[PDB]
Write a protein that binds this ligand. Structure first.
Ligand SMILES: Cc1cc2nc3c(=O)[nH]c(=O)nc-3n(C[C@H](O)[C@H](O)[C@H](O)COP(=O)(O)OP(=O)(O)OC[C@H]3O[C@@H](n4cnc5c(N)ncnc54)[C@H](O)[C@@H]3O)c2cc1C
Ligand SMILES: Cc1cc2nc3c(=O)[nH]c(=O)nc-3n(C[C@H](O)[C@H](O)[C@H](O)COP(=O)(O)OP(=O)(O)OC[C@H]3O[C@@H](n4cnc5c(N)ncnc54)[C@H](O)[C@@H]3O)c2cc1C
Ligand SMILES: *SC[C@H](NC(=O)CC[C@H](N)C(=O)O)C(=O)NCC(=O)O
Ligand SMILES: *SC[C@H](NC(=O)CC[C@H](N)C(=O)O)C(=O)NCC(=O)O
Lengths: 461, 461
């Protein structure tokens, strides 16, 4: 049993970030990874997704070419040209992160980890045992798929992972789900030329965001050509002579349910959720607590119910974002190796950007969350809706919507929500401001930058 | 002599903003304008400039088309197509601002104002006299041109105003000046196809910005194809059979001066400065103080040396930006009409964006200003230089540079400087944060947004 000061199971964002900060503090650490370093962020998530979003953005700009005085570009998008460049980029990143581990003197144990029945917390990787007084589980999650028991032929569809393996643009695609991944995938596929349908159980997408955003995002999708199939779900999928045939039930409230067949579908993408990766860890051997979904339960300091064992990242099921896994992982390293017992991540006011078209930026409470928390009498919102100056000379149009949620007499800014061109790079700074407890007065006392879309947030009345 | 509560001379940003806020407070106001409402911002500045910048941006993106899997666009940019759409847009804005004045019940006196020798401050517009207990001079400025006495043929060149009248793209252009207007013009002309040269007196552009920005901006210009003529100035200009011939002297320190002839120039644009518009106001008739350039002198409350007469905007010569004229104008209205004697604009931490390629964002002190103000021992800077992820798959490259200037033990953020894609919409929020007195810790405690360029500012080490 080789002993270390820190043993990290999982080589994705949470695992790498924590192991590296620990090593900086003098800890002898090792990272166990059964696949590719970089985890979801580098391999099947953030990075490849963003490259595809930049490609989709090129598509929209090509539509505005003639309006801006240029000749019209012909069209024919070549998927494998970008797929190949994207894969290469991911390869460069895997090499970079491996190098980052070596320079910090972090040992990389390649294989699948699983706990043993040994009294003191110990894991086994390919017949060898390893132990440490501090062990971090940062194994992440997977895309969830329906069981063939409830949805016959469900296994004919692909998940976000499968999306990154596609070597050709699907001519006809149906995305199932109403969360951010679904919206993002539908947005890229449609912009790139696929006949796209987004199938959602209710009437709007991103229903957990502020209502102004769910409403506006749903409309922008339709304006951009995406067919949103409302109150609809898949009943069954089957393989026909050319493509898949999807049977769906549409049940609009106050109407009779109707069955519809969607034929000649090239790509069915399930974007319905994420399942934690814990089933094969043998958690039970140490009695480590998990909820009924398989998420490891942790306290505010990322401690599990077992001493010396912690968890961060997607495996815990809360705030499933790369920067959150990273910050929690680093705060933990400082707590254990710099003895700062007050070191932990504040899960409040975590900013998020959804790479839709236009992108969405959000931080803080939605209007409904502020109302519940402070009371209708104490919540004041400010909003604006305008057409960005970029579209002043174009036939194609998009809108920019912004909303500020203030609380109490001082009008403390407790939430900012927006969708529009440039919102992806606009959010970070306002998030710093909200994290500092800015009031509407602080925003108003900052001189605006003209001409930009961002100046609208400091000139709301 | 018709009397009002507030008389505003000048219908640009400062004038409109102040008159409108005053009217809201119950004042009977009137605005005198000898030309087009909207002033520089709408007619020959911000608005038309931004439309041209968006057009230039389309040009650069067209260069990356093939790298992103698209067919190559042919090229031929048609200037008059965009010029015509741009003029129309400006026309829509003039109508909008006129309407804004009428709905607020603000009287518009069309004509050129000039003060009279009457004891109590009075002006005359087309034979009629007008007076008010509060009179605001917001007459702005003009582009400066060389006198034919020092530069023979100087009148053959055009200014930024003339740039907006051009009906065709100049094949060969030479821009003279090293400030933001010059950089912006050179950037648009070059991106759009003009053989462009930028002639500067020293070795770098924007020498009053942080050195990291002047250096980087100078390099980006050259990388984008702009010929920067260093230590050079025009000695004389003349009209030849086809174009202008510019004679310039290049005097590199430690070298002998050399005279060069630049032939077949289609467009010579003087972008050397701005002169205040006060010469025809008959200021002397009331003994209103001005510096030797013609700028009206004012105190922190925008008061001139004469009671009941104020000045805001470009005419005062400080912080020549639209949002500054507007904020100063509004603060003044509240001071006079809401009796808030503490109402005035804080000229510190005013953010600025230079619409270069990539754009530049800056707020606060440069490293040299912080050093002088706090002492070398108390100034710590953090910086990063990286290639945006957008260029991961392109042959063409641009860089993103960011710099944070902190002061004293607490590392108060006193300056942020950056150049890169998306920096135009990225600045506003950090400016709110700096205006609140954020320290490096506040930035560091804000969770990042991935993948974006803006997250680099909250993860500096
Ligand atoms: C399509 C998609 C798009 C996304 N876009 C964004 C975005 O734009 N911005 C954002 O912030 N977030 C985004 N996310 C979410 C983000 O990717 C995750 O929140 C984050 O990567 C999770 O990090 P992690 O370290 O918890 O897990 P992971 O990155 O999944 O790391 C887990 C690692 O542990 C390894 N592992 C598992 N079990 C074992 C074992 N027993 N032994 C050894 N190794 C093991 C796995 O192989 C994997 O490499 C996206 C996610 C997806 C899927
Ligand atoms: C090319 C260019 C690009 C710029 N880009 C930006 C940018 O992107 N962002 C930014 O913030 N700033 C920018 N600026 C600066 C900004 O335009 C000015 O700081 C601002 O418009 C000045 O407003 P003002 O009210 O002081 O003056 P002005 O807008 O010039 O208003 C003065 C008005 O008064 C009128 N007037 C003058 N004399 C009289 C008189 N005697 N009687 C009656 N009427 C009179 C004039 O006709 C004019 O309409 C730019 C400027 C230029 C020239
Ligand atoms: S996509 C891989 C992840 N990278 C980023 O999130 C960049 C983070 C910033 N550079 C930062 O916080 O330093 C990832 O897995 N990062 C792990 C790491 O240790 O950088
Ligand atoms: S280009 C004309 C100017 N407009 C802007 O600067 C927009 C300002 C914001 N909408 C705001 O502060 O409200 C201008 O001349 N504005 C004068 C005005 O009163 O809006």
């Amino acid at each position: 049993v080789a002993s270390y000061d820190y043993l990290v199971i999982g080589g994705g964002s949470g695992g790498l970030a924590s192991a590296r900060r620990a090593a900086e503090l003098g800890a002898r650490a090792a990272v166990v990874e059964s696949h590719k370093l970089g985890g979801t962020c580098v391999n099947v998530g953030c990075v490849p997704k963003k490259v595809m979003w930049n490609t989709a953005v090129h598509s929209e700009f090509m539509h505005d070419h003639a309006d801006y005085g240029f000749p019209s570009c012909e069209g024919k998008f070549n998927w494998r040209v970008i797929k190949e460049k994207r894969d290469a980029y991911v390869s460069r990143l895997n090499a970079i992160y491996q190098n980052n581990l070596t320079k910090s003197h972090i040992e990389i144990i390649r294989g699948h980890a699983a706990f043993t029945s040994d009294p003191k917390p110990t894991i086994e990787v390919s017949g060898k045992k390893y132990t440490a007084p501090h062990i971090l589980i940062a194994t992440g999650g997977m895309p969830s798929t329906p069981h063939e028991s409830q949805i016959p032929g469900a296994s004919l569809g692909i998940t976000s992972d499968g999306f990154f393996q596609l070597e050709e643009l699907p001519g006809r695609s149906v995305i199932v789900g109403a969360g951010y991944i679904a919206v993002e995938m539908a947005g890229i596929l449609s912009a790139l030329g696929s006949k796209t349908s987004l199938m959602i159980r209710h009437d709007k997408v991103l229903r957990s965001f502020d209502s102004m955003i769910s409403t506006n995002c749903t409309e922008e999708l339709e304006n951009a050509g995406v067919e949103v199939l409302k109150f609809s779900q898949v009943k069954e999928v089957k393989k026909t002579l050319s493509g898949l045939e999807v049977s769906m039930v549409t049940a609009v409230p106050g109407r009779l349910p109707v069955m519809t067949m969607i034929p000649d579908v090239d790509c069915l993408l399930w974007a319905i959720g994420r399942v934690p990766n814990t089933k094969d860890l043998s958690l039970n051997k140490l009695g480590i607590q998990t909820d009924d979904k398989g998420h490891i339960i942790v306290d505010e300091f990322q401690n599990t119910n077992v001493k010396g064992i912690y968890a961060v990242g997607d495996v815990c099921g809360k705030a499933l974002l790369t920067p959150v896994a990273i910050a929690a992982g680093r705060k933990l390293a400082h707590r254990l190796f710099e003895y700062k017992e007050d070191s932990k991540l504040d899960y409040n006011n975590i900013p998020t950007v959804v790479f839709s078209h236009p992108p969405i930026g959000t931080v803080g409470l939605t209007e409904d969350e502020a109302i519940h928390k402070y009371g209708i009498e104490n919540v004041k919102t400010y909003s604006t809706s305008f057409t960005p100056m970029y579209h002043a000379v174009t036939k194609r149009k998009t809108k920019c919507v912004m909303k500020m949620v203030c609380a109490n007499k001082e009008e403390k800014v407790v939430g900012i929500h927006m969708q529009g061109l440039g919102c992806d790079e606009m959010l970070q700074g306002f998030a710093v401001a909200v994290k500092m407890g800015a009031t509407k007065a602080d925003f108003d006392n900052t001189v605006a930058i003209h001409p930009t879309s961002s100046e609208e947030l400091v000139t709301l009345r």
